[PDB]
Design brief:
part of a larger assembly; 4 chains; 367 residues; alpha/beta; two-stranded antiparallel ribbon; 13 helices; 9 strands; 53% helix; binds nicotinamide-adenine-dinucleotide; binds zinc ion; oxidoreductase
Chain lengths: 367, 367, 367, 367
């Protein structure tokens, strides 16, 4: 079958990039619905309003309700119609950005995406994760188009909590290993085809960037300043990981992330933190060489990502809990079946327990 | 300043991909203006009509006049309006594809691009080269958006004259060296920013793919059959070279290509064939190591690309002609000024003569 | 533009070299004004007087006032005229040597330079740093000529405080990284041209000599004895670093050194000690690979150079202080603008905080 | 004993550098005696006169008599006195430059040196080779000072006969091997001390530059154009080879060059061409590894340097002739005694015959 790569039309990144939003957006449309979470608008609404106004654009500011839900999408569509908006700008974290993408899809208008953290690879994908209003997962809304533009102000990202950059490292860490597994098995990607050389190269570049720049970038993040190492990790967490997962493929790491919703234990932990441990588990499952698992565990440990169940607050009755996680990870349609040679719940259960023991030993030897 | 990468929204490649055009295009629009050159429609119009009709799409076939000109764009716009077309599909070589992109820009509608040869990196770029009707260069039309979709049927490409695949190798050969020069000098790219890591990786992947797959792919091309080596070179000539040049940067090789319009000698040679010799000249100009120039010259020689002036039919009064080429290559606004340390016409003139002598010696030692 | 390398006419180094001063100086001139600081004359005046007298030279001893100031230069010129001196010998540390060079320039006579410590790369350069009498910086006096001869008695150097050899290592450490940055950006050097291959080779030789010989040389320095390792480090701190900085280029490390005069905190620390931390900061700024920063930090740590702000006694209100340092480091005309891609104060501020955190972590892991 | 490196005060190189002579010379002196050979003044006198006049300098043009002789030095001194010249500029090849240096020494004034070919390492040294008027060698005049400035217009050099650049490659080829031999034996250099690390690094850089750039530079030379490869070889033939031989040491290669004046056969061959074969002979004498001799022989062959006696037109009665050469090469005071372990005429004779056979075999295998 065909080989396919998808991408946002234009990806932009640099310090102060919010100040240039208006000039970047003007070739696309004149009247913008701005979905932003209240915290982000707290510090960014004035700059954003100025950027668009100076470029001659209309801006209808719509504070985000917090959840990417069908009710919230229709609420924002009503608001957008009153202002005759012809495009959507989402500014914030993953839930805000998914909502903007879905809203623009249903209005059939361009979308611009301004991540104010680099915490997941959501910004670039042709995908919105729909939840109920209460926050329970609902469905994956596959979009016919990636976002028109993605604009990352790296100074805003650097000012955010450093834990959220580490979380993005965890999400991006899975990219190479899941795309490599899909290329080994010949699996179809979310772009709908087999993998291109381009996507595999960006996926592998993602991993090497994290290895080379992750620790340097976290020093900058903890000081809330921008260095080229932080710039490179933001690119890896956003563009490389986004194109990497969507056009290179998903496999065990993300099925294992999804499987942990079968227990309540890890509720306080971010998407990318659970994906980091899912990645360690995939490496056990595919029996990666010792040096490769050690390198990944050490990278995770160096930026604060969990390498044990207890670091995700998964404690007590581990056998019952890991059976729940393993069974949900292997549910019909899950991406774990993209692993070479197929995988069942018994193998995932085994990998979960062993990956946990590996991390415990690692933490012990680190004293 | 910001770092920026641009891309077509979706790039698709595989054998028989023309048969799936209708299903690929349906999420974008329902009524398609199809710009195709008469030779391509000669063999492809029936398959293309079937693909779109089976998917429930309207197709208004508009045979292409041959030149990407303002008169031709307005002619096609009139034809499209009569059929109430809501999108444009260009199918053919570079001139057809540039026309489709420019037409869709002026109609403000999506564009799909179906290269039937892999002869240049035109398909993916947010750029149309406008000519007069007589064929004289007119202007560069910079587009606000890359094409929505690019669809390469590799069986159609493999059936085309093999010389046109080699020409695409020549255009793609420049990608790594021009992007690397721009990254060394800190030059602004056509995407409007400094280079991303992603773009440099795709540019370098482009070069390595040509080295590893070029000769294997030409065997397939000469037999008019599809192998994975030909598939990889098509990707390199189209997606990698396209994103590579636009988001990684242009430099001396393409300024030297442009400079050869100052003489009539190379009129029978394709865009990518002149770019191959421009690349050898850039390597002399930047004083690349001997092994690197030899590798490039050998790659060019192995797929039939020119490594001497005479192989471009540039013969007689070489000093006067190369002074004309060097001066036009250094004209104000040319990309040769993206080279590290700056470059003037005396240095380009020197590099032209020396690159020519290098190629002559290479051909001699090859007997 | 032209490529230019400058050098003192003759550089001499070895144990007991002061005893041979007279024979080395005789081909240059017969009547010598000897500028020496009182401490150095305390131990060296008798040997120096004997060397010159035995060779048939006149010596007018002029104890140095301590500061390289315009008033001091004119005072010494008056003294020299009374004795009809036809050349100048400076013997001591950097302030003495700069004064001798400037004095000889204004008398229009040859100058010989005898460093009695290897604490900076001042001895070889065509530059004097002029201060007011109170010690405030005044101006850079660019000289039309490097010193005629430089004579380093390595036994006198080895007898000096070991901290002053480590300081020279810190000044010399910057040489490779600043010259490499200038060669990457194409910056003009203080020799007035672009860099030669010769200057880049001496700059890189400087760095490798410090890596290979620094710790061995400090053992000798602490014992106040001469070994070949100490001999090689003296050459690196004097000739290699001198030609390296002047003909290879200055960049961020020295602008950052200059920037710390915007705060009073580091007043007790030597020129080369501040340059060592400026070098670590430049490595953060140019995002050097982790292994390279670690190697530099470990080299600094092994000879006692500072790798944190607190080791320069910069403590308390770090954000305000580092903003002052960053702004002065980026003042108009500073060498930080020789860095590839340009640099502003926000980037320098970020690099300062991150380099400080890197050094703190290094010291912590070293326990 | 002390380690000593000597250098011209300022070395300048680039295309069109003759046009900037006046501004480069003005800080040194106002009234210049210009010694130039008639051929060079034929093309350069007008530019040179303009450069000095525009900078406000006086120029007394004195066409050179052709030989560096005591009679010629006194003739030029008389001419200089009539014009009250306060400095000397030599412009031309080695004989002109040696004369300018010696003249400035006897007038006790600064000297500037403008090589118009890069054929030997004469320009930078504190040495003039004095001949009788008939052209017989007379003596080595050791100078107390290297030239104040050396200015190489690389466009003038590139315009000269290409054979003269190859000759300079031959002279420069000896630099690394003779300096390395002197460093192995601990020999005293012409700077009067043991070798510095700086001088050994420049000597080795010289050799590697010839290996990497020699063939690329000869392509440029044959086209009479300037490329960066030609620029690097000019630096290697002039600055690197000059400092390399004088401060790194001479050994067998140059003693063997000197020894060939004992026969008339090689009279039509340039200094550097005889030094190339002397270098091959030294490699036999020191029993260099096979790969090293092959590399040197191949480098020589690739730029047209002789690797056999017959290529120096030394033919007929080879045993008698090589005994004459070997005996003169080993004369008292010759530099061949700087070779490790000492050398006598029987060993040199053996090396001459064997080096000749090696070159003959090399030429044969090359067909
Ligand atoms: N569509 C995709 O491809 C994709 C991929 C991965 C994840 N997702 C979805 O993204 C959601 C999680 O995204 P998330 O991890 O970013 O959580 P999130 O969107 O809820 O935001 C995280 C928090 O960061 C806060 N914060 C503090 N300082 C901030 C600052 N400077 N900038 C922005 N926010 C700041 C925000 O207010 C927010 O509470 C999930 O619903 C996930 O399903 C989608
Ligand atoms: N916009 C950009 O970024 C960009 C980049 C490079 C070149 N260009 C422009 O592209 C133009 C040249 O493009 P080109 O080299 O492809 O020439 P072209 O578009 O004129 O087509 C080359 C020929 O291939 C013929 N042919 C034979 N078999 C074919 C087959 N199976 N499929 C398709 N064609 C077949 C075509 O009819 C055509 O005559 C130039 O105008 C150039 O300026 C634009
Ligand atoms: N012109 C240039 O290129 C250049 C380069 C770097 C620094 N500088 C200037 O050099 C000055 C600092 O030079 P410095 O760091 O050598 O300080 P310094 O010249 O003041 O001397 C340092 C101290 O070492 C003392 N001491 C103890 N034992 C000694 C011994 N055996 N020999 C010599 N001194 C001994 C000296 O008396 C002196 O107090 C600054 O003014 C700086 O601007 C100039
Ligand atoms: N002092 C030292 O350290 C040292 C080192 C090596 C050689 N030497 C001496 O240098 C002398 C040989 O020097 P040489 O080989 O350069 O020969 P040379 O000085 O006689 O000049 C070579 C010829 O090049 C001609 N020519 C043609 N085009 C020219 C152009 N553009 N520019 C300059 N010249 C051009 C010149 O007129 C000249 O006839 C010998 O006397 C040698 O002893 C001295
Ligand atoms: Zn994820
Ligand atoms: Zn092209
Ligand atoms: Zn310094
Ligand atoms: Zn020589």
């Amino acid at each position: 079958m065909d080989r396919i790569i998808q991408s946002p039309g234009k990806y932009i990144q640099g310090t102060g990039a919010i100040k240039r939003l208006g000039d970047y957006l003007k070739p696309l449309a004149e009247r913008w619905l701005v979905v932003g979470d209240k915290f982000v608008l707290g510090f960014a609404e004035e700059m954003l309003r100025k950027s668009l106004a100076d470029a001659g654009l209309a801006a209808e500011i719509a504070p985000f309700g917090g959840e990417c839900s069908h009710n919230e999408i229709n609420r924002l569509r009503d608001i957008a119609g009153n202002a005759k908006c012809t495009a959507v700008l989402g500014i914030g974290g993953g839930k805000t950005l998914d909502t903007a993408k879905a809203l623009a899809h249903f209005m059939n208008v361009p979308v611009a995406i301004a991540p104010t953290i680099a915490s997941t690879d959501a910004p670039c994908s042709a995908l919105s994760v729909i939840y109920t209003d209460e926050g329970e997962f609902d469905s994956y809304l596959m979009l016919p188009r990636n976002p028109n533009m993605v604009i990352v102000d790296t100074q805003i990202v650097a000012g955010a909590p450093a834990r959220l950059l580490a979380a993005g490292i965890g999400d991006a860490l899975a990219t190479w290993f899941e795309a490599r597994a899909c290329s080994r098995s010949g699996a179809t990607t979310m772009a709908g085809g087999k993998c291109t050389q381009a996507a595999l190269a960006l996926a592998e570049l993602c991993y090497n960037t994290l290895l080379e720049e992750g620790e340097k970038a976290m020093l900058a993040a903890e000081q809330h300043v921008v260095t080229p190492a932080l710039e490179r990790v933001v690119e890896a967490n956003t563009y490389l990981s986004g194109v990497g997962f969507e056009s290179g493929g998903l496999a065990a790491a993300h099925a294992i992330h999804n499987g942990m919703t079968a227990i309540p234990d890890a509720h306080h932990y971010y998407h990318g933190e659970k994906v980091a441990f899912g990645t360690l588990t995939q490496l056990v499952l595919e029996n990666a060489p010792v040096d490769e698992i050690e390198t990944v565990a050490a990278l995770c440990h160096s930026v604060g990502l969990p390498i044990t169940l207890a670091q995700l607050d998964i404690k007590g009755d581990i056998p019952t809990k890991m059976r729940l996680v393993a069974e949900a990870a292997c549910a019909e349609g899950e991406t774990i079946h993209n692993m070479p040679g197929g995988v069942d719940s018994d193998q995932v259960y085994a990998a979960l327990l062993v990956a946990d023991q590996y991390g415990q030993r690692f933490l012990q030897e680190w004293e």
